[PDB]
Amino acid sequence: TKFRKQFRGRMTGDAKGGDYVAFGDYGLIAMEPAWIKSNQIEACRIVMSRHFRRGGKIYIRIFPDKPVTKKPAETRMGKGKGAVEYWVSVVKPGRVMFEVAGVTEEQAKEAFRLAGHKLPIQTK
Amino acid sequence: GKQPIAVPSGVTVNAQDGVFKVKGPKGELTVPYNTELTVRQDGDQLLVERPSDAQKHRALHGLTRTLVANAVKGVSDGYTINLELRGVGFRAKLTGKALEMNIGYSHPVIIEPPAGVTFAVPEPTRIDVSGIDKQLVGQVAANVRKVRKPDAYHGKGVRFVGEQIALKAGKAGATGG
Amino acid sequence: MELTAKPRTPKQKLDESMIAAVAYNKENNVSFALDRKAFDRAFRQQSTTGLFDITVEGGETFPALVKAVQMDKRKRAPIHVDFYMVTYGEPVEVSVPVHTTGRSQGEVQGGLVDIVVHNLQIVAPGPRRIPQELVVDVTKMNIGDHITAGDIKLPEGCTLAADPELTVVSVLP
Amino acid sequence: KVRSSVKKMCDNCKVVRRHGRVLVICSNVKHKQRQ
Amino acid sequence: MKKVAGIVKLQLPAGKATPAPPVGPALGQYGANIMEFTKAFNAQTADKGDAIIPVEITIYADRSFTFITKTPPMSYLIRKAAGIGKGSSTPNKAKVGKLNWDQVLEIAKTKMPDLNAGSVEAAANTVAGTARSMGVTVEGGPN
RNA sequence: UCGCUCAGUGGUUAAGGAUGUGUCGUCGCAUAGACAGCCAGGAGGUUGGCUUAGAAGCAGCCACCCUUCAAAGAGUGCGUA
C-alpha cells in the first residue's frame, strides 16, 4: 500500500527529520522515529475511527516508508531474502489536527494507544 | 493554623516538652508531644507558635487546638455514637465488659468491650453507648463492617441517621420469606 | 517589552528561558535576545494586528509586526524563528493564515470540521506589514459555490507569487 | 495491576503520597485501585 | 380526601381504555378508572374525535370520580389545521414542513386560561414554537 | 550556603501514571471579606411533534420558543416497562 514494486533496498539510521508545519487547529507530532509496526499504522485510522462519526475527514502528514527483510531462523548465517515486515519511521511531523470542538482530541487520545513511545498532541 | 474554640473556664494544660493532658470532668487524654512543638498555656484562651520557619510546624501543628476536641468530648462536650441495625434483631447487653450481640451463629465471636466504650444498654431496639474515647467512637461504629456486613439490598444495619444513601438495587427489586 | 542584550554567540540562546533574536534594520544588524515569559503573544491576537513599540537600549523606536508564526517543531519550545521590522526599501514571507470556525454545515450529506493542515498561503503584500482581516472557510459548503484561494478578501491590492491557484480551506466534506 | 504513568482519570481521584504511587479513586463508588 | 393528595402526570390519549389493548384495567387498580371512563374525558371531551386533553388526575382513597381538569382547547386550535404525516422526520436536513402565513395569529392567541402568564408580549412567548420539534420556518411571528 | 529532601533509588530497567516538590506566566476573584462545606426558591404553554399502549424530564428521531419574577437550563445523574 506504498510503492507497488520498484525494487527493494533501504538502510537504517535515526535522528529527527523534517516535516513539521504550523497547524491550523490542534496539531500533533511524533518526536523522533518511534515505533509503529506498519501493521500498526494499519490500525491507526480505524482505531481513530471506532465511531468518531458516520463521516468525517481531516489531514495527516506522513506515509509508509519501509521494508526490512527478516528471514527465517533455521540457521542465520547468510545473506538475505525479502522485507516481510514494514515500517513508517518519522520525525516530529503532524498527523491529525481536529476541526470540531468538544471532542478536542478524543481520537488523539487512543492514538497514543498504538504508541510504545511518546507522541504528544500539542496544538497550533 | 487554628486556636479559637468553645469552652468556659474549667480546664488547665501543662507546659513540659509535651506532657499536658486535660483534667476536667473525666479525661486525662494521652498527650505525648515532640520537642520542636510544645506551646504553653496563656489563660482561658490559647495561642499559636512558630519557633521555626518552614515545614516544621505544619505536620505537627496548624491543627493542634484541633485534637483538643478528642478531649473536649467529655470535659465539657458530649459524646454519643448512635446507630441502628436490621440484620436479625437488635439486642446487646454488657453485664461487665462483654456484649453478646444476638445475631446469626451459635459460634460466639464476642469482642472485648474496652473501658470507655463499654456499653450501657437501656433501649434494646437501638443500643446506647457512652463512648468517651473518640478513638473507638467511629471505629466501634466500624466494628460491625468486617464480619456481619449488612445485606447489599434493603436499607439495614449501617446507617448514620437519615441520608440519601438509599437501599441497593439490582435488575429490579423484591423481598419475602 | 524592552531590549538590551547582545551576545554574538549561541551561548545565551541555549540556556533555559531566552531565544536568540535576529535584526537587520537599515544599518542595524546584530543578534539580541530577551526573555520568554509572555513571549507567545504572536499567534494569539497580535498577528500583525496593530504595531506597538519596544524601547531598545539606547536609540530609536521601531514599531514592526510579528513576521508570521512558527512555535517549535515537535515540542513547544520555539527555537529561533524570525522578526520583521519595517525599514528596508526585498524579502518575502507573509502571514495571511486562513482559519476554520463554526458549526460545520457538513451534516448535510457527510463531512466533518474544516480540516486544513498546511502552513503556507498565496499572498504577497508589497511593503512589509500583513494586516489582520480575512475569512474564507465558510460560504455554504455544498456545491456550486466553494471558497478557496485565488482572489478572496485579499489584504490590500492584488497578489504576486508565481501561479495564483493554491488549495487551502476548500470544501469537499 | 499496572505500574506506570496512567494519569489521574476523574479529578475526584486524589493522587496519594505513599511509597511512590499515582492512584485513582473514582468520583463516588465504583473503583478503589492502588499499586 | 383524608388530609393529603397525590401527584403524578399522565398523557391521557383520546379516551381509549375500554376494550383491552389500550390501557384499561392495566391502569386502574390503585384508584384510576375501572368502571368510569365516560363523563370524565368523554364528558366535555367530545368537542372533537382526536385531541389531547391534559389534566393532573386526582387519585383518592375513594372511587367515585367526577371532573376537575385543565383547559385543553389551550393546546388545540393549533393542532387541527395540520396533522401527523410528513411533519416530524429529522428536523435540519432541507426545507420540509409548513403551516400557513396567516395561521401565525390565532396560533399563540391561545395563552390565557392555562398559561399562568397570559398578557401582551407574554401570552404568545411560551407558545411561539409548538411545531419547533418539526423544525420549520416561522413566516410571520405573532403580530 | 542550600534544595529534590526520606524512596535506601543512588548498586539489573522502560511506553503508561499518583491533586509529592524548591521556582518562574493568566484567569472568573474572599480590601461585593467568591466558588469549594447550608437554610429558603424546587412550577407553568407543553406533561414538547413524532416510533403512537403512556414513554408523560429519561426504550426512540428531532428540537431548546416563555412563565410567577429582579433571574432560573426541551432535564446531568438517581428510581424506571
PDB file of N, CA, C and O in Angstrom, chain C residues 33-84:
ATOM      1  N   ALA C  33      18.306  39.157  22.020  1.00  0.00           N
ATOM      2  CA  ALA C  33      17.765  38.020  22.763  1.00  0.00           C
ATOM      3  C   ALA C  33      16.390  38.237  23.395  1.00  0.00           C
ATOM      4  O   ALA C  33      15.368  38.017  22.749  1.00  0.00           O
ATOM      5  N   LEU C  34      16.404  38.642  24.667  1.00  0.00           N
ATOM      6  CA  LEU C  34      15.231  38.914  25.511  1.00  0.00           C
ATOM      7  C   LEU C  34      14.719  37.611  26.128  1.00  0.00           C
ATOM      8  O   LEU C  34      14.960  36.526  25.589  1.00  0.00           O
ATOM      9  N   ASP C  35      14.014  37.713  27.251  1.00  0.00           N
ATOM     10  CA  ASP C  35      13.498  36.529  27.941  1.00  0.00           C
ATOM     11  C   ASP C  35      12.424  35.796  27.139  1.00  0.00           C
ATOM     12  O   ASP C  35      12.404  35.850  25.913  1.00  0.00           O
ATOM     13  N   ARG C  36      11.522  35.116  27.846  1.00  0.00           N
ATOM     14  CA  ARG C  36      10.440  34.377  27.197  1.00  0.00           C
ATOM     15  C   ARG C  36       9.373  34.010  28.222  1.00  0.00           C
ATOM     16  O   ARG C  36       9.256  32.855  28.625  1.00  0.00           O
ATOM     17  N   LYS C  37       8.605  35.022  28.619  1.00  0.00           N
ATOM     18  CA  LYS C  37       7.513  34.951  29.594  1.00  0.00           C
ATOM     19  C   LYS C  37       6.273  34.921  28.714  1.00  0.00           C
ATOM     20  O   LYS C  37       5.807  33.869  28.276  1.00  0.00           O
ATOM     21  N   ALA C  38       5.749  36.122  28.489  1.00  0.00           N
ATOM     22  CA  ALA C  38       4.573  36.375  27.671  1.00  0.00           C
ATOM     23  C   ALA C  38       5.156  36.576  26.279  1.00  0.00           C
ATOM     24  O   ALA C  38       4.870  37.553  25.588  1.00  0.00           O
ATOM     25  N   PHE C  39       6.006  35.625  25.907  1.00  0.00           N
ATOM     26  CA  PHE C  39       6.685  35.570  24.619  1.00  0.00           C
ATOM     27  C   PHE C  39       6.033  34.393  23.908  1.00  0.00           C
ATOM     28  O   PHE C  39       6.598  33.306  23.784  1.00  0.00           O
ATOM     29  N   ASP C  40       4.807  34.652  23.471  1.00  0.00           N
ATOM     30  CA  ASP C  40       3.968  33.712  22.745  1.00  0.00           C
ATOM     31  C   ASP C  40       2.678  34.507  22.591  1.00  0.00           C
ATOM     32  O   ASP C  40       1.572  33.992  22.757  1.00  0.00           O
ATOM     33  N   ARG C  41       2.861  35.788  22.283  1.00  0.00           N
ATOM     34  CA  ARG C  41       1.778  36.739  22.072  1.00  0.00           C
ATOM     35  C   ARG C  41       1.787  37.028  20.576  1.00  0.00           C
ATOM     36  O   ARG C  41       1.283  38.056  20.123  1.00  0.00           O
ATOM     37  N   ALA C  42       2.369  36.104  19.818  1.00  0.00           N
ATOM     38  CA  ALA C  42       2.425  36.217  18.365  1.00  0.00           C
ATOM     39  C   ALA C  42       1.042  35.800  17.888  1.00  0.00           C
ATOM     40  O   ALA C  42       0.100  36.592  17.907  1.00  0.00           O
ATOM     41  N   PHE C  43       0.936  34.543  17.468  1.00  0.00           N
ATOM     42  CA  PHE C  43      -0.324  33.978  17.013  1.00  0.00           C
ATOM     43  C   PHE C  43      -1.182  33.722  18.254  1.00  0.00           C
ATOM     44  O   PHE C  43      -1.142  32.659  18.868  1.00  0.00           O
ATOM     45  N   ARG C  44      -1.932  34.754  18.615  1.00  0.00           N
ATOM     46  CA  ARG C  44      -2.848  34.771  19.749  1.00  0.00           C
ATOM     47  C   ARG C  44      -3.866  35.820  19.328  1.00  0.00           C
ATOM     48  O   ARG C  44      -5.029  35.532  19.057  1.00  0.00           O
ATOM     49  N   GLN C  45      -3.369  37.052  19.303  1.00  0.00           N
ATOM     50  CA  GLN C  45      -4.119  38.244  18.936  1.00  0.00           C
ATOM     51  C   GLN C  45      -3.071  39.348  18.982  1.00  0.00           C
ATOM     52  O   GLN C  45      -2.865  40.001  20.006  1.00  0.00           O
ATOM     53  N   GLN C  46      -2.398  39.511  17.844  1.00  0.00           N
ATOM     54  CA  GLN C  46      -1.335  40.490  17.631  1.00  0.00           C
ATOM     55  C   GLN C  46      -0.651  40.096  16.327  1.00  0.00           C
ATOM     56  O   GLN C  46       0.402  40.634  15.985  1.00  0.00           O
ATOM     57  N   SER C  47      -1.239  39.144  15.612  1.00  0.00           N
ATOM     58  CA  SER C  47      -0.686  38.679  14.348  1.00  0.00           C
ATOM     59  C   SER C  47      -0.793  39.812  13.335  1.00  0.00           C
ATOM     60  O   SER C  47      -1.741  39.868  12.553  1.00  0.00           O
ATOM     61  N   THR C  48       0.189  40.707  13.374  1.00  0.00           N
ATOM     62  CA  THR C  48       0.260  41.884  12.506  1.00  0.00           C
ATOM     63  C   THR C  48      -0.864  42.833  12.900  1.00  0.00           C
ATOM     64  O   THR C  48      -0.859  44.003  12.512  1.00  0.00           O
ATOM     65  N   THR C  49      -1.830  42.346  13.669  1.00  0.00           N
ATOM     66  CA  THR C  49      -2.926  43.204  14.103  1.00  0.00           C
ATOM     67  C   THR C  49      -2.334  44.252  15.040  1.00  0.00           C
ATOM     68  O   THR C  49      -2.017  43.951  16.191  1.00  0.00           O
ATOM     69  N   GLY C  50      -2.175  45.474  14.545  1.00  0.00           N
ATOM     70  CA  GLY C  50      -1.606  46.532  15.361  1.00  0.00           C
ATOM     71  C   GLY C  50      -0.094  46.432  15.404  1.00  0.00           C
ATOM     72  O   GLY C  50       0.483  45.421  14.999  1.00  0.00           O
ATOM     73  N   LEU C  51       0.551  47.487  15.895  1.00  0.00           N
ATOM     74  CA  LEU C  51       2.009  47.521  15.980  1.00  0.00           C
ATOM     75  C   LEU C  51       2.468  48.513  17.041  1.00  0.00           C
ATOM     76  O   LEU C  51       2.533  49.714  16.786  1.00  0.00           O
ATOM     77  N   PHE C  52       2.780  48.018  18.234  1.00  0.00           N
ATOM     78  CA  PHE C  52       3.261  48.895  19.293  1.00  0.00           C
ATOM     79  C   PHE C  52       4.707  49.338  19.088  1.00  0.00           C
ATOM     80  O   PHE C  52       5.119  49.678  17.979  1.00  0.00           O
ATOM     81  N   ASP C  53       5.469  49.343  20.183  1.00  0.00           N
ATOM     82  CA  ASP C  53       6.870  49.754  20.161  1.00  0.00           C
ATOM     83  C   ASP C  53       7.695  48.795  21.015  1.00  0.00           C
ATOM     84  O   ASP C  53       7.275  47.669  21.271  1.00  0.00           O
ATOM     85  N   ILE C  54       8.865  49.243  21.456  1.00  0.00           N
ATOM     86  CA  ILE C  54       9.759  48.386  22.227  1.00  0.00           C
ATOM     87  C   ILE C  54      10.785  49.060  23.140  1.00  0.00           C
ATOM     88  O   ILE C  54      11.184  48.485  24.150  1.00  0.00           O
ATOM     89  N   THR C  55      11.218  50.270  22.783  1.00  0.00           N
ATOM     90  CA  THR C  55      12.212  50.995  23.570  1.00  0.00           C
ATOM     91  C   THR C  55      13.474  50.149  23.754  1.00  0.00           C
ATOM     92  O   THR C  55      13.671  49.537  24.802  1.00  0.00           O
ATOM     93  N   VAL C  56      14.316  50.120  22.726  1.00  0.00           N
ATOM     94  CA  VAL C  56      15.558  49.351  22.770  1.00  0.00           C
ATOM     95  C   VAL C  56      16.619  50.120  23.544  1.00  0.00           C
ATOM     96  O   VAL C  56      16.613  51.351  23.564  1.00  0.00           O
ATOM     97  N   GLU C  57      17.538  49.393  24.173  1.00  0.00           N
ATOM     98  CA  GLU C  57      18.600  50.007  24.963  1.00  0.00           C
ATOM     99  C   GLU C  57      19.448  51.027  24.209  1.00  0.00           C
ATOM    100  O   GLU C  57      20.444  50.679  23.575  1.00  0.00           O
ATOM    101  N   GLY C  58      19.041  52.292  24.289  1.00  0.00           N
ATOM    102  CA  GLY C  58      19.786  53.360  23.648  1.00  0.00           C
ATOM    103  C   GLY C  58      19.069  54.270  22.669  1.00  0.00           C
ATOM    104  O   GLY C  58      18.596  55.338  23.060  1.00  0.00           O
ATOM    105  N   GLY C  59      18.976  53.865  21.406  1.00  0.00           N
ATOM    106  CA  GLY C  59      18.337  54.713  20.418  1.00  0.00           C
ATOM    107  C   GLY C  59      17.193  54.161  19.590  1.00  0.00           C
ATOM    108  O   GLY C  59      16.972  52.952  19.521  1.00  0.00           O
ATOM    109  N   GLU C  60      16.475  55.091  18.957  1.00  0.00           N
ATOM    110  CA  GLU C  60      15.326  54.835  18.089  1.00  0.00           C
ATOM    111  C   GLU C  60      14.056  54.213  18.663  1.00  0.00           C
ATOM    112  O   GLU C  60      13.921  54.018  19.867  1.00  0.00           O
ATOM    113  N   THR C  61      13.125  53.928  17.755  1.00  0.00           N
ATOM    114  CA  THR C  61      11.826  53.331  18.062  1.00  0.00           C
ATOM    115  C   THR C  61      11.275  52.724  16.771  1.00  0.00           C
ATOM    116  O   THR C  61      10.875  53.453  15.862  1.00  0.00           O
ATOM    117  N   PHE C  62      11.271  51.400  16.690  1.00  0.00           N
ATOM    118  CA  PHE C  62      10.774  50.701  15.509  1.00  0.00           C
ATOM    119  C   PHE C  62       9.531  49.883  15.865  1.00  0.00           C
ATOM    120  O   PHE C  62       9.605  48.949  16.661  1.00  0.00           O
ATOM    121  N   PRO C  63       8.373  50.231  15.282  1.00  0.00           N
ATOM    122  CA  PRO C  63       7.113  49.522  15.546  1.00  0.00           C
ATOM    123  C   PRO C  63       7.152  48.024  15.229  1.00  0.00           C
ATOM    124  O   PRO C  63       7.098  47.191  16.133  1.00  0.00           O
ATOM    125  N   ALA C  64       7.236  47.712  13.936  1.00  0.00           N
ATOM    126  CA  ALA C  64       7.287  46.341  13.416  1.00  0.00           C
ATOM    127  C   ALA C  64       6.027  45.539  13.737  1.00  0.00           C
ATOM    128  O   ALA C  64       5.136  46.014  14.444  1.00  0.00           O
ATOM    129  N   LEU C  65       5.966  44.316  13.211  1.00  0.00           N
ATOM    130  CA  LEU C  65       4.827  43.435  13.434  1.00  0.00           C
ATOM    131  C   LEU C  65       5.316  42.123  14.050  1.00  0.00           C
ATOM    132  O   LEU C  65       6.185  42.131  14.919  1.00  0.00           O
ATOM    133  N   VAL C  66       4.773  40.999  13.589  1.00  0.00           N
ATOM    134  CA  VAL C  66       5.148  39.699  14.129  1.00  0.00           C
ATOM    135  C   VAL C  66       6.001  38.795  13.232  1.00  0.00           C
ATOM    136  O   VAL C  66       6.756  37.960  13.723  1.00  0.00           O
ATOM    137  N   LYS C  67       5.870  38.979  11.921  1.00  0.00           N
ATOM    138  CA  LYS C  67       6.571  38.178  10.925  1.00  0.00           C
ATOM    139  C   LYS C  67       6.186  36.706  11.095  1.00  0.00           C
ATOM    140  O   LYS C  67       6.913  35.921  11.702  1.00  0.00           O
ATOM    141  N   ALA C  68       5.010  36.367  10.565  1.00  0.00           N
ATOM    142  CA  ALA C  68       4.438  35.021  10.616  1.00  0.00           C
ATOM    143  C   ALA C  68       4.501  34.419  12.018  1.00  0.00           C
ATOM    144  O   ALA C  68       4.678  35.133  13.008  1.00  0.00           O
ATOM    145  N   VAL C  69       4.345  33.101  12.089  1.00  0.00           N
ATOM    146  CA  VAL C  69       4.401  32.377  13.357  1.00  0.00           C
ATOM    147  C   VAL C  69       5.286  31.156  13.115  1.00  0.00           C
ATOM    148  O   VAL C  69       5.705  30.911  11.982  1.00  0.00           O
ATOM    149  N   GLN C  70       5.577  30.387  14.161  1.00  0.00           N
ATOM    150  CA  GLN C  70       6.437  29.220  13.996  1.00  0.00           C
ATOM    151  C   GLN C  70       6.461  28.259  15.181  1.00  0.00           C
ATOM    152  O   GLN C  70       6.574  27.047  14.996  1.00  0.00           O
ATOM    153  N   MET C  71       6.354  28.791  16.395  1.00  0.00           N
ATOM    154  CA  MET C  71       6.382  27.959  17.596  1.00  0.00           C
ATOM    155  C   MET C  71       7.626  27.078  17.579  1.00  0.00           C
ATOM    156  O   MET C  71       8.732  27.554  17.329  1.00  0.00           O
ATOM    157  N   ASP C  72       7.438  25.791  17.843  1.00  0.00           N
ATOM    158  CA  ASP C  72       8.547  24.846  17.844  1.00  0.00           C
ATOM    159  C   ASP C  72       8.183  23.512  17.210  1.00  0.00           C
ATOM    160  O   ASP C  72       7.073  23.005  17.379  1.00  0.00           O
ATOM    161  N   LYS C  73       9.136  22.958  16.473  1.00  0.00           N
ATOM    162  CA  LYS C  73       8.979  21.672  15.806  1.00  0.00           C
ATOM    163  C   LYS C  73       8.865  20.564  16.852  1.00  0.00           C
ATOM    164  O   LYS C  73       9.719  20.448  17.732  1.00  0.00           O
ATOM    165  N   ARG C  74       7.803  19.766  16.752  1.00  0.00           N
ATOM    166  CA  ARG C  74       7.528  18.659  17.676  1.00  0.00           C
ATOM    167  C   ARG C  74       7.171  19.109  19.088  1.00  0.00           C
ATOM    168  O   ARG C  74       6.024  18.987  19.515  1.00  0.00           O
ATOM    169  N   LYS C  75       8.162  19.621  19.809  1.00  0.00           N
ATOM    170  CA  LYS C  75       7.969  20.068  21.187  1.00  0.00           C
ATOM    171  C   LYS C  75       7.092  21.313  21.284  1.00  0.00           C
ATOM    172  O   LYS C  75       6.041  21.395  20.648  1.00  0.00           O
ATOM    173  N   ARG C  76       7.535  22.289  22.073  1.00  0.00           N
ATOM    174  CA  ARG C  76       6.783  23.525  22.246  1.00  0.00           C
ATOM    175  C   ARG C  76       7.690  24.644  22.760  1.00  0.00           C
ATOM    176  O   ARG C  76       7.236  25.641  23.318  1.00  0.00           O
ATOM    177  N   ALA C  77       8.986  24.451  22.562  1.00  0.00           N
ATOM    178  CA  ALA C  77       9.993  25.423  22.964  1.00  0.00           C
ATOM    179  C   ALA C  77      10.430  26.092  21.673  1.00  0.00           C
ATOM    180  O   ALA C  77      11.430  25.708  21.068  1.00  0.00           O
ATOM    181  N   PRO C  78       9.681  27.115  21.233  1.00  0.00           N
ATOM    182  CA  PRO C  78      10.006  27.825  19.994  1.00  0.00           C
ATOM    183  C   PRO C  78      11.487  28.136  19.829  1.00  0.00           C
ATOM    184  O   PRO C  78      12.002  29.083  20.424  1.00  0.00           O
ATOM    185  N   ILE C  79      12.172  27.322  19.027  1.00  0.00           N
ATOM    186  CA  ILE C  79      13.586  27.536  18.757  1.00  0.00           C
ATOM    187  C   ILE C  79      13.595  28.801  17.900  1.00  0.00           C
ATOM    188  O   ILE C  79      12.556  29.150  17.346  1.00  0.00           O
ATOM    189  N   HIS C  80      14.711  29.504  17.742  1.00  0.00           N
ATOM    190  CA  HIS C  80      14.549  30.720  16.959  1.00  0.00           C
ATOM    191  C   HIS C  80      13.939  30.784  15.570  1.00  0.00           C
ATOM    192  O   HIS C  80      14.378  30.159  14.607  1.00  0.00           O
ATOM    193  N   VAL C  81      12.915  31.632  15.537  1.00  0.00           N
ATOM    194  CA  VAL C  81      12.053  31.968  14.409  1.00  0.00           C
ATOM    195  C   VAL C  81      12.462  33.043  13.403  1.00  0.00           C
ATOM    196  O   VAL C  81      13.114  32.775  12.392  1.00  0.00           O
ATOM    197  N   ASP C  82      12.064  34.276  13.727  1.00  0.00           N
ATOM    198  CA  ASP C  82      12.363  35.460  12.925  1.00  0.00           C
ATOM    199  C   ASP C  82      11.638  36.656  13.534  1.00  0.00           C
ATOM    200  O   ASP C  82      10.936  36.506  14.536  1.00  0.00           O
ATOM    201  N   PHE C  83      11.821  37.833  12.920  1.00  0.00           N
ATOM    202  CA  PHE C  83      11.205  39.104  13.326  1.00  0.00           C
ATOM    203  C   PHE C  83      11.419  40.272  12.361  1.00  0.00           C
ATOM    204  O   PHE C  83      12.504  40.853  12.296  1.00  0.00           O
ATOM    205  N   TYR C  84      10.364  40.601  11.623  1.00  0.00           N
ATOM    206  CA  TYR C  84      10.354  41.697  10.652  1.00  0.00           C
ATOM    207  C   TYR C  84      10.225  43.042  11.361  1.00  0.00           C
ATOM    208  O   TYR C  84       9.608  43.157  12.421  1.00  0.00           O
TER     209      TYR C  84
END
